[PDB]
Each structure stands twice: as structure tokens, then as C-alpha cells.
Amino acid sequence: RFLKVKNWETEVVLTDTLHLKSTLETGCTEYICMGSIMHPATKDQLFPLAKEFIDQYYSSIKRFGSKAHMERLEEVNKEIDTTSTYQLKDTELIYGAKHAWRNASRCVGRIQWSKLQVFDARDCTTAHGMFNYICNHVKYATNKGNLRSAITIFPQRTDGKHDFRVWNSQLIRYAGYKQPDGSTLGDPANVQFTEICIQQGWKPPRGRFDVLPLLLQANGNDPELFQIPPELVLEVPIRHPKFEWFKDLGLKWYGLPAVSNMLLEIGGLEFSACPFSGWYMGTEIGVRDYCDNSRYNILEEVAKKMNLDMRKTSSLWKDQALVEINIAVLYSFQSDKVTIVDHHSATESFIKHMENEYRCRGGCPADWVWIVPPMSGSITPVFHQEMLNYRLTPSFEYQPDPWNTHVW
Amino acid sequence: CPRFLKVKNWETEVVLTDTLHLKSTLETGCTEYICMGSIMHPDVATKDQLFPLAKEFIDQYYSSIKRFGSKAHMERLEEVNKEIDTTSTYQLKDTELIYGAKHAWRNASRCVGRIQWSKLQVFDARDCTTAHGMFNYICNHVKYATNKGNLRSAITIFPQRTDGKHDFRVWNSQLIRYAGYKQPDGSTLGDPANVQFTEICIQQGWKPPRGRFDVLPLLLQANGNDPELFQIPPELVLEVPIRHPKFEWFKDLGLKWYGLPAVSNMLLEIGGLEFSACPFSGWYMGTEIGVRDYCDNSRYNILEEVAKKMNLDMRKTSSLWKDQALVEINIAVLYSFQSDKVTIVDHHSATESFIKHMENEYRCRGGCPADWVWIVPPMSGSITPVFHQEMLNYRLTPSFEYQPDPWNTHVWK
Ligand code: HEM
Ligand code: HEM
Ligand SMILES: CNCCN(C)c1cc(C#N)cc(CCc2cc(C)cc(N)n2)c1
Ligand SMILES: CNCCN(C)c1cc(C#N)cc(CCc2cc(C)cc(N)n2)c1
Ligand SMILES: C[C@H](O)[C@H](O)[C@H]1CNc2nc(N)[nH]c(=O)c2N1
Ligand SMILES: C[C@H](O)[C@H](O)[C@H]1CNc2nc(N)[nH]c(=O)c2N1
Ligand SMILES: [Cl-]
Ligand SMILES: [Cl-]
Ligand SMILES: [Zn+2]
């Protein structure tokens, strides 16, 4: 059927037909919605998926049913028959990577989807090779503060025993340390990964913001450690425009948000190492990274310095401290000319993106639970936007952490 | 369906196990191919439709009072069955009515206030026959629930649907709400959400004061007759003027709100029976007023005015001026209610209590349907514990449901 979504603030109604193209599962049923659950080959399986993808690629360049289209399908089936897999053309790799971003329901940044620099790293054979390609990625994307979106794609999965994996969850992240007194120094989210680096021989500085080394696995081999050259790691000291004491907190963060633990799926092929990066929305750092109880958890300290009454929850001291922190982050990146987008501007762009996608594509799959910012929700336009979530392919998918699978 | 579904809390690592979903009764709107979890809204019952719905409910009731399979259980089933056969409907016992109302609340997946579910005063108004009768019942409800600021949750239940042409309806969406007036110049005075209902009231003969916070009259429909207008005695309407603990100027904005949140346009379903007039009330979470009523662009929309008074830089979005003002408004709301001793709960307290409630429900009941999109507060989401709590949404009965606005369906006499 045609499905309608309404914006309750503008009364704008859009009509979705795109969802008819989905074949993957959402997780829900007629009886139970799992919308807030975070995580809900063979030659025979392979070809239909390959066909579907090649078909949609040749449709997007308006040469569906052409000789080139027919030739490519033939080429792909013969190759699947004779090698149990196939290789994407360069044009296909690029199309597929941009579309995995376009289809990413949880991403508020998609208005940028077609501007993505794609680095083909499918000729990589060793962890040193991967280090080289990742360094080049980081340098390109960083671009002295004028951040550019990019993805680097390493060889696809074959038998599952020769996987390329970036073990880091992000290319740039800070270590976290368990203390004797059972507290956590640095980023608690990365304590386990940090411990693995230590055991593999990384020498920790044991500070609050130690940039982790890259831990890189090529062709199913044991992973190897590499230090990203520091001149490639752009960082912003966080200060506040009015509270001169804020800088005294010693807070900083990295300019480049780069997800490196997801799996890119295109036409049945699985790219288990595909680090991708953009630029930050302020709340990612200022709300989640800094203020999650299980993260840097800085509300209490900031509220102290603001001299707030912290005895009752109904003083909203946490809410007040939260806003100031996010003001500082935006102000700091802006002052250092490092690309960043605030949650008002970002969500406004997403609504415009949604309207574009309905108009040119017949829909836009979107996960309200993830799209709405973790602060000030209903004063952003997305809060009031009904969204439909469905899974389109090519896609980015979660995959198991490699330490829970790898045999050394 | 899988017998056991697990939910995780991403902050605490606590994992809970749901089995209650196996009792799911109706549609969510989702499918395996599409999720409609952010969609706001995704001819009577026949004898043969009614029989199993009633039995399902009666069984659940007798199971709750630990008399399942009892002689009393079997006799109730038989009496209900005979009634449906000789009349095409049945009447609930007072005990069942009370149980059903409490459970509709217990099952309301969009409600963060459910820790309170078993403490609900139930007023049985099924003997009511006229709009004047409805007014009397509603006045008594408001007075009881208001309790001079020490609010008490309550519901008043009017006669169930029969043929569908004799519905009891409260045309108001809330028992207490402010009027909205559209001006020739396109501006709106009062609450823009209630312009349509206000116009209806005026057409029925209400004389509007045409102010910014005019309490609307009750427009009450009994037995499918044309609705009738009544003025709630003002002494029954408790209000709170909003002031701020720091900003002396805040009171000069002239804001106030009503103390009693009371929903009156929903339908209560128990055992296949339909109570189309069942106004219920509790007490406010501050953000309902401070974020939604006051700061929605399409409501009172006071952010700019407040920001200017705060002398914020309103030139870039990145200054977070809106976010800053929003917090101060919500501080004012909580402060003003607590100062006037009117029950109110802040969003931190409410969500923390909800998490404790949900965990208790998982352990004593096997689950707790919850709508994350609705449960998570409209400000500061991720610093409340519900943001990090995976939830499962499904429909249990008895339940509160949406129903069409009565002006779209009413057959004018
Ligand atoms: C260019 C600026 C971008 C912005 C401002 C942005 C913004 C965001 C935000 C705020 C989230 C939620 C993150 C979280 O809460 O964990 C997200 C998620 C996501 N983004 Fe984007 N993004 C950008 C670029 C990209 C690019 C270049 C890609 C891939 C090519 C991408 C793919 C994804 C995916 C797959 C998710 C879901 C991640 C998950 O499920 O954990 N984004 N983005
Ligand atoms: C006692 C204090 C209570 C609190 C703090 C509370 C809190 C809330 C809040 C914040 C919402 C979201 C409202 C909105 O955004 O429109 C809500 C929705 C709801 N509440 Fe509760 N509530 C309370 C009492 C009750 C009672 C007594 C009932 C029924 C007997 C009830 C049933 C519902 C239902 C059915 C919804 C969904 C409303 C809709 O779909 O529009 N609540 N509640
Ligand atoms: C899981 N969400 C909460 C923690 N946050 C905010 C978070 C954790 C990790 C990791 N690992 C990574 C991110 C980055 C998400 C992202 C990706 C891209 C391409 C751009 C962007 N602005 N954000 C965000
Ligand atoms: C529709 N959601 C946002 C508008 N809000 C906040 C809103 C609109 C109407 C109406 N009509 C009614 C409410 C009250 C909901 C409610 C009910 C009860 C029993 C308690 C409580 N705290 N809130 C809230
Ligand atoms: C339980 C819930 O699914 C979980 O906390 C989600 C909620 N929404 C989110 N939204 C974003 N953008 N990022 C997240 O990590 C989460 N976490
Ligand atoms: C489009 C979306 O479903 C809509 O804006 C919802 C979001 N969550 C909500 N949550 C609550 N408590 N109240 C609401 O009115 C809404 N509105
Ligand atoms: Cl952006
Ligand atoms: Cl409460
Ligand atoms: Zn769903």
C-alpha cells in the first residue's frame, strides 16, 4: 500500500511508496514493536542478491535492460559459479557505498549522502597496508579542519576465516583505564579494547585522553598495533564563551568521527572492514560522550563550578549543566574552524532531506528513536515528524566484536 | 512467536525477559518489513465477537483474584454468556469495572506514570442518563481529584456503548483546557491547539471572554443526544501562576496553567465492552507544560519572548539560546507548582520511578509494554534513564484507545 507520514507541527503529509522495495527484516511483528531495540554466503543465496543490486544500479543510470546490463548479469553469474563469489566494478563499489549511507535509517546526516569520497582498498593484503590506507583516509577527511566525508573499503569476506577487520570501534578514540579504587580513568566505553592493546604490547600513558593505537587485522591473521601519526589527529580543547573556568576542566575531543566496526553489505558481498567518517553533531560529544553516566560523566563537576543547587532533581541542575557543556563544544570547534553541526541545524537539514527523498525516491527510511537528538527533543523539527523505518540494501550492519570470534 | 524476548539497558547492562507479550491482543501497526513506532495513530460488537472477548477478560479477572476455575468463576462465565445471548451485551460487576480500569492504565504503553496504577479512584457513573448528570459527575470528579492541590488520580466511567447511536461522549479533549481564538490577521489568541473546539463551543452558544487563558466550558453528550454546554465552577479549577526563583521578570510574562491534567476523549475497552466516555486524571510531569504546552511552535510558543528577556544571543542556532530558555521555563513551572503545593513530578524523578516500575512488572507480571517514543521526555532525553532502556511495545487489554472526534461523527438531532 501507499503509506502516509505526517508532520504534526507543519501538518505536511508525505506519501511513502519506497518501503515496497524492502525485503530485509525490521524486527517487529503485527503484535510487537521492537523499535527501541538496538540490535534486533552460498552461490544460490548469492546470485539473487547480486542480481537485485546490479538491477538497481543499472536502473539508477537509466540503462536498465541494456546490453551492458545484460552483459554484467551474465558476467556475475559465471563468476559466482566458478569462484563462489564476485567482484564489483569500481562504479558499482562507489554507487553501493553512497547508497548504504543513503539507506542508513539511523543517520541524521544523510542530506550529504551523495558527497562521499570512496577509497577502494580491495587490493590490501596486510595490516601495514591497512595502516597506510587508514592514515591516508584520516588525512584526507581531516583536511585541516574542513572535514570531508570518506569511506575506505578493504577486501570483502570470503570464507569468514580470512576477514579484514578494524578492531577499534572508531578510528580515533580515547583509552579508558580501570583503577585500583575501581573507578575508571578516561573513556569507560573502551576499557576492554584498551586492555587488549595493553596485552598486545601497547604502552599506555594512562591519561584521561590518550589516543588509542590502531589494532588491525588483515586476511584473518592476528591483529597488529600501529600509532596514528599525531600530526594527523586533530583535537579541540573545549572552552566556554562566558565561563572562563571551563577550560580548567581540561576537556578536549577529536575532530574526526570515524566508525570502523560496522559491516558494509553490497549485492550480497560483505565488507567487514569499511571505516567511514563525516563530521560531528555537537550533542554526540556534548551529551552522549561527556554526559552519559557510563561515559565521561561530567555533569556533577560542571554543575559544581556553575554553583548550582544539586540537592533536588527538580532544580534541573543537570539540564542546566548539560546546555552549557553543549554550548562550549560548539563554540570550541567553531573557534578552531573545525566542522561541526548543531542539533537544530542538523535536524532542520534532515527534514529538508526527507522532503527531497519523498519527492525523488518515494520515501526515506528513518529511525525516530535515533534521529531525535538526546537533548531538547521537541524543540527540534524531527520530534514532530512521523517516520517509517524499513531496511533497504546496500546497507551498513552491525557485526560481532572481533575479539569474541578470533582464534589467535 | 518466540516465548522469551529480552530487553537490555545500555547504561546498567541489566537484561530483562518478557513473556507477557504472548498475551498481545491487537495490532501495533508494524510488520516484519516496516516499523511504525513513531506514527501517532496507526458498528458494534456482534454476539459472536463479544463471547470470547468477555470470557478472556473474566478469566483474567478470576485469575487475578486467585479464584481461577472456582465455582464463582464458572458461574460468572455462565451468567455473562446468557446475558450476551439474550441481550447482545453484558454488564460488568463493580469489582470487574474497577479491575478493568486499573488494568487499562497498567497496560497504557505511552504512560510514564504507571507506578501509580493500582491507586486509582474509580467513579461508576453507569447510571447517568443526561448531560446535566454528566456535569454533576464530572464536577465531583474534579473536586475529588483536585483535593486542594494534593492531587489524586481518578476516572469516571459513563454508560458503555450499546448500538453506537446512543454514545456518551465528553466532546472536550481534556476536562480543563484553555480556549484558542483565531484572529482576522491570522494571529492566534490563547491556545492554538483548541481553536477548532473553541469555535464549536461558540457556535453552541458559549460567550467567549476572548482572553489568553480562558477555561473552556464542558460540552457533554449523553445517550447520543446533541451535546450541551456547562461552565465548570471556577472555584473547582485550580490554577498556578508561573514565576521563576531567580528571574523576577518571569512573572511579568503573565503565564499560568491548570493543576489537573484530565484526558476526556479516549475510549476505555473492557471485556469487549466500550466506554466512550471515561475521563481520567492524574498529576502533571513538568515537561508536559514547560516543554510541550509552552514551547511547541504550534502551542503557546514562548521561547523567543523568554530568550529576549534573558538577553540571549538569538542570531545563531549554535548559541543554543532555545535550549537555554527551555530549561529556565521548566525550572519556573516546577518551582511554581511546588511553591503553591500542587502535586507535580519532574522528568528525572518520573523516569527513574518508571524504570523501577518496569523492572517490578517484568518480575511479577512477565513484562511491561512501553512506547519509548512516548516514554522518553521531550527535553534532556539521554540524561534520563529511560533513554537507555530497550522497550517492547504491544497491546494488552483492557486498554485505552483513540476514538474519532465526536463532531466528525455526530448525527445532529
Ligand atoms: C557528514 C556528517 C554526518 C553527520 C553530522 C552524521 C550524524 C550522525 C549521528 C548523530 C548519528 C547517531 C550516532 C550515534 O548516536 O551513535 C549517525 C549514525 C550513523 N551514521 Fe551518520 N553522520 C554523518 C556522516 C555519515 C557518513 C559519511 C556515513 C557513512 C557513509 C554515516 C553513516 C551512519 C550510520 C550507518 C549510522 C548508524 C550507526 C549505528 O547504528 O551505530 N554517517 N550519524
Ligand atoms: C498519576 C500521574 C500520571 C503521570 C505523571 C502521567 C504521565 C503521563 C505522560 C507524561 C504522558 C504523555 C502525555 C502526552 O505527552 O500527551 C501520559 C500519557 C498517557 N497516560 Fe499517564 N500519567 C499519570 C496518570 C494517568 C492515569 C490516572 C491514567 C488513566 C487511568 C493515565 C493514562 C494515560 C494514557 C492512556 C496515555 C496516552 C495518552 C495519549 O495517547 O494521548 N495516566 N501519561
Ligand atoms: C552509540 N551512540 C552513542 C555514542 N556515540 C555518540 C557514538 C559512538 C561511536 C562509537 N564507537 C561512534 C559515534 C559516531 C557516529 C557518527 C558517525 C559519523 C560517520 C558521523 C557522525 N557525526 N557520527 C558516536
Ligand atoms: C499530545 N501530547 C502533547 C500535548 N500534551 C502534553 C497533552 C495534551 C492533552 C490533551 N488534550 C492532554 C495531556 C495530558 C496527558 C496526561 C494525562 C494524565 C492522566 C496525566 C498526565 N500527567 N498527563 C497532554
Ligand atoms: C534503548 C535505546 O534504543 C538506546 O538508548 C538508543 C536510543 N536512541 C539513540 N539514538 C542515537 N542517536 N544514538 C544512540 O546510541 C541511541 N541509543
Ligand atoms: C511524530 C511523533 O510520533 C510525535 O511527535 C510524538 C513523539 N513522542 C511523543 N511523546 C509524548 N509523550 N507526547 C507526544 O505528543 C509525542 N509526540
Ligand atoms: Cl551536516
Ligand atoms: Cl509520578
Ligand atoms: Zn515497530
mmCIF file of C-alpha atoms in Angstrom, chain B residues 168-335:
data_model
loop_
_atom_site.group_PDB
_atom_site.id
_atom_site.type_symbol
_atom_site.label_atom_id
_atom_site.label_comp_id
_atom_site.label_asym_id
_atom_site.label_seq_id
_atom_site.Cartn_x
_atom_site.Cartn_y
_atom_site.Cartn_z
ATOM 1 C CA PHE B 168 -21.996 9.131 25.866
ATOM 2 C CA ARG B 169 -19.112 11.453 24.925
ATOM 3 C CA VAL B 170 -17.166 14.259 26.531
ATOM 4 C CA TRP B 171 -16.523 16.487 23.493
ATOM 5 C CA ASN B 172 -13.656 18.198 25.343
ATOM 6 C CA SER B 173 -10.275 16.557 24.831
ATOM 7 C CA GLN B 174 -9.302 17.491 28.411
ATOM 8 C CA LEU B 175 -11.740 18.365 31.236
ATOM 9 C CA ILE B 176 -9.768 21.552 31.849
ATOM 10 C CA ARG B 177 -8.181 23.432 28.923
ATOM 11 C CA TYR B 178 -7.758 26.965 27.619
ATOM 12 C CA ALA B 179 -9.599 28.420 24.598
ATOM 13 C CA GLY B 180 -7.902 29.471 21.394
ATOM 14 C CA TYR B 181 -9.150 32.235 19.116
ATOM 15 C CA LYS B 182 -8.037 32.797 15.517
ATOM 16 C CA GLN B 183 -7.816 36.487 14.643
ATOM 17 C CA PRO B 184 -8.694 38.016 11.233
ATOM 18 C CA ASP B 185 -4.999 38.930 10.858
ATOM 19 C CA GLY B 186 -4.023 35.283 11.217
ATOM 20 C CA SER B 187 -2.600 35.543 14.747
ATOM 21 C CA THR B 188 -3.968 33.277 17.473
ATOM 22 C CA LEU B 189 -5.055 34.348 20.955
ATOM 23 C CA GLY B 190 -4.937 31.654 23.658
ATOM 24 C CA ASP B 191 -4.114 28.021 22.854
ATOM 25 C CA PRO B 192 -3.850 27.319 19.091
ATOM 26 C CA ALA B 193 -4.497 23.594 19.771
ATOM 27 C CA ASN B 194 -8.089 24.317 20.813
ATOM 28 C CA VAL B 195 -9.227 26.755 18.108
ATOM 29 C CA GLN B 196 -11.488 24.188 16.458
ATOM 30 C CA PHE B 197 -13.128 23.070 19.701
ATOM 31 C CA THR B 198 -13.445 26.683 20.860
ATOM 32 C CA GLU B 199 -15.257 27.591 17.615
ATOM 33 C CA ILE B 200 -17.650 24.679 18.195
ATOM 34 C CA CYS B 201 -18.345 25.919 21.747
ATOM 35 C CA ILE B 202 -19.025 29.448 20.496
ATOM 36 C CA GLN B 203 -21.406 28.111 17.866
ATOM 37 C CA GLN B 204 -23.271 26.174 20.570
ATOM 38 C CA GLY B 205 -23.804 29.479 22.383
ATOM 39 C CA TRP B 206 -20.729 29.917 24.584
ATOM 40 C CA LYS B 207 -19.877 33.588 25.105
ATOM 41 C CA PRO B 208 -16.060 33.840 24.989
ATOM 42 C CA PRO B 209 -14.111 36.216 27.262
ATOM 43 C CA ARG B 210 -11.530 36.184 24.437
ATOM 44 C CA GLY B 211 -8.516 36.130 26.721
ATOM 45 C CA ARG B 212 -5.298 34.143 26.749
ATOM 46 C CA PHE B 213 -6.213 31.611 29.440
ATOM 47 C CA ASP B 214 -9.985 31.157 29.292
ATOM 48 C CA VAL B 215 -11.110 27.853 30.851
ATOM 49 C CA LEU B 216 -13.317 26.170 28.225
ATOM 50 C CA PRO B 217 -16.876 25.028 29.088
ATOM 51 C CA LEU B 218 -17.720 21.337 29.233
ATOM 52 C CA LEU B 219 -19.604 20.179 26.136
ATOM 53 C CA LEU B 220 -21.304 16.976 27.188
ATOM 54 C CA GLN B 221 -23.178 14.322 25.201
ATOM 55 C CA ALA B 222 -25.478 11.806 26.878
ATOM 56 C CA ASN B 223 -27.177 8.854 25.207
ATOM 57 C CA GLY B 224 -26.325 10.018 21.665
ATOM 58 C CA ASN B 225 -28.279 13.294 22.066
ATOM 59 C CA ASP B 226 -26.862 16.684 20.969
ATOM 60 C CA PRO B 227 -24.107 17.843 23.366
ATOM 61 C CA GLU B 228 -24.891 20.516 25.982
ATOM 62 C CA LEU B 229 -22.677 23.296 27.413
ATOM 63 C CA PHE B 230 -21.787 23.786 31.101
ATOM 64 C CA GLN B 231 -19.440 26.170 32.934
ATOM 65 C CA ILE B 232 -17.160 24.445 35.448
ATOM 66 C CA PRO B 233 -17.482 26.315 38.758
ATOM 67 C CA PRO B 234 -14.273 28.417 38.835
ATOM 68 C CA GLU B 235 -13.587 27.500 42.486
ATOM 69 C CA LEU B 236 -13.142 23.924 41.233
ATOM 70 C CA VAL B 237 -10.474 24.976 38.729
ATOM 71 C CA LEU B 238 -7.103 25.098 40.452
ATOM 72 C CA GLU B 239 -4.519 27.206 38.636
ATOM 73 C CA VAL B 240 -0.852 28.067 39.194
ATOM 74 C CA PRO B 241 0.715 31.357 38.075
ATOM 75 C CA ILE B 242 4.194 30.701 36.760
ATOM 76 C CA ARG B 243 7.126 32.556 38.326
ATOM 77 C CA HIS B 244 10.874 31.875 38.449
ATOM 78 C CA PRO B 245 13.103 31.559 41.535
ATOM 79 C CA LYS B 246 15.803 33.822 40.026
ATOM 80 C CA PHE B 247 14.232 35.946 37.309
ATOM 81 C CA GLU B 248 11.888 38.442 38.965
ATOM 82 C CA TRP B 249 10.652 39.393 35.485
ATOM 83 C CA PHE B 250 9.331 35.920 34.686
ATOM 84 C CA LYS B 251 6.036 36.598 36.466
ATOM 85 C CA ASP B 252 5.565 39.615 34.170
ATOM 86 C CA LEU B 253 5.028 37.195 31.252
ATOM 87 C CA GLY B 254 1.573 36.561 32.733
ATOM 88 C CA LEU B 255 1.740 32.794 32.396
ATOM 89 C CA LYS B 256 -0.233 30.288 34.390
ATOM 90 C CA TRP B 257 -1.577 26.789 33.937
ATOM 91 C CA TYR B 258 -4.167 24.429 35.391
ATOM 92 C CA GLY B 259 -3.130 21.903 38.046
ATOM 93 C CA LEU B 260 -5.278 18.983 36.876
ATOM 94 C CA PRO B 261 -4.362 17.027 33.695
ATOM 95 C CA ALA B 262 -7.521 15.141 32.760
ATOM 96 C CA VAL B 263 -7.942 13.288 29.478
ATOM 97 C CA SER B 264 -11.539 13.002 28.289
ATOM 98 C CA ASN B 265 -11.648 11.978 24.619
ATOM 99 C CA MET B 266 -10.354 8.443 24.931
ATOM 100 C CA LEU B 267 -12.245 5.165 24.871
ATOM 101 C CA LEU B 268 -11.879 2.504 27.548
ATOM 102 C CA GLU B 269 -12.298 -1.089 26.432
ATOM 103 C CA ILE B 270 -13.017 -3.821 28.989
ATOM 104 C CA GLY B 271 -14.040 -7.381 28.091
ATOM 105 C CA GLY B 272 -15.144 -6.263 24.650
ATOM 106 C CA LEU B 273 -17.352 -3.541 26.155
ATOM 107 C CA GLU B 274 -16.710 0.047 25.056
ATOM 108 C CA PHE B 275 -16.857 3.030 27.387
ATOM 109 C CA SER B 276 -16.725 6.028 25.024
ATOM 110 C CA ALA B 277 -16.873 8.478 27.916
ATOM 111 C CA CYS B 278 -14.274 7.780 30.576
ATOM 112 C CA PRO B 279 -12.437 10.934 31.651
ATOM 113 C CA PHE B 280 -9.366 10.199 33.776
ATOM 114 C CA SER B 281 -6.897 12.421 35.557
ATOM 115 C CA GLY B 282 -3.607 12.228 37.421
ATOM 116 C CA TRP B 283 -0.971 14.857 38.067
ATOM 117 C CA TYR B 284 1.468 16.625 35.728
ATOM 118 C CA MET B 285 5.052 15.867 34.768
ATOM 119 C CA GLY B 286 6.596 19.351 34.453
ATOM 120 C CA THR B 287 7.748 18.929 30.862
ATOM 121 C CA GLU B 288 4.186 18.428 29.631
ATOM 122 C CA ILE B 289 3.568 22.083 30.474
ATOM 123 C CA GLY B 290 7.094 23.513 30.311
ATOM 124 C CA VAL B 291 8.189 21.918 27.055
ATOM 125 C CA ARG B 292 5.087 20.952 25.076
ATOM 126 C CA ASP B 293 2.256 23.310 26.142
ATOM 127 C CA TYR B 294 4.597 26.332 26.367
ATOM 128 C CA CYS B 295 7.321 25.783 23.774
ATOM 129 C CA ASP B 296 5.808 23.851 20.880
ATOM 130 C CA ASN B 297 5.812 26.238 17.904
ATOM 131 C CA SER B 298 2.127 25.369 17.400
ATOM 132 C CA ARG B 299 1.164 25.923 21.052
ATOM 133 C CA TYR B 300 1.967 28.943 23.271
ATOM 134 C CA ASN B 301 5.412 29.204 21.647
ATOM 135 C CA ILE B 302 7.029 31.413 24.330
ATOM 136 C CA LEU B 303 10.734 30.597 23.665
ATOM 137 C CA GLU B 304 11.544 33.819 21.829
ATOM 138 C CA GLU B 305 9.866 36.110 24.366
ATOM 139 C CA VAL B 306 11.683 34.347 27.216
ATOM 140 C CA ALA B 307 15.017 34.359 25.372
ATOM 141 C CA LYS B 308 14.756 38.135 24.792
ATOM 142 C CA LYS B 309 14.069 38.740 28.490
ATOM 143 C CA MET B 310 17.118 36.574 29.224
ATOM 144 C CA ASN B 311 19.098 38.755 26.789
ATOM 145 C CA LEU B 312 20.499 35.765 24.910
ATOM 146 C CA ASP B 313 22.194 35.952 21.516
ATOM 147 C CA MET B 314 19.370 34.857 19.232
ATOM 148 C CA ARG B 315 21.303 35.272 15.986
ATOM 149 C CA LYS B 316 22.830 31.798 15.638
ATOM 150 C CA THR B 317 21.129 28.469 16.399
ATOM 151 C CA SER B 318 24.528 27.303 17.675
ATOM 152 C CA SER B 319 24.337 29.649 20.675
ATOM 153 C CA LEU B 320 21.714 27.155 21.972
ATOM 154 C CA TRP B 321 19.527 30.063 23.116
ATOM 155 C CA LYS B 322 16.381 27.951 22.687
ATOM 156 C CA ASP B 323 17.847 25.144 24.783
ATOM 157 C CA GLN B 324 18.920 27.590 27.477
ATOM 158 C CA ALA B 325 15.489 29.277 27.709
ATOM 159 C CA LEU B 326 13.674 25.937 27.653
ATOM 160 C CA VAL B 327 15.437 24.864 30.853
ATOM 161 C CA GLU B 328 14.569 28.094 32.683
ATOM 162 C CA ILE B 329 10.915 27.771 31.671
ATOM 163 C CA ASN B 330 10.815 24.257 33.062
ATOM 164 C CA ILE B 331 12.509 25.384 36.259
ATOM 165 C CA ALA B 332 9.810 28.018 36.640
ATOM 166 C CA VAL B 333 6.993 25.505 36.114
ATOM 167 C CA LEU B 334 8.273 23.076 38.775
ATOM 168 C CA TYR B 335 9.076 25.902 41.181
#
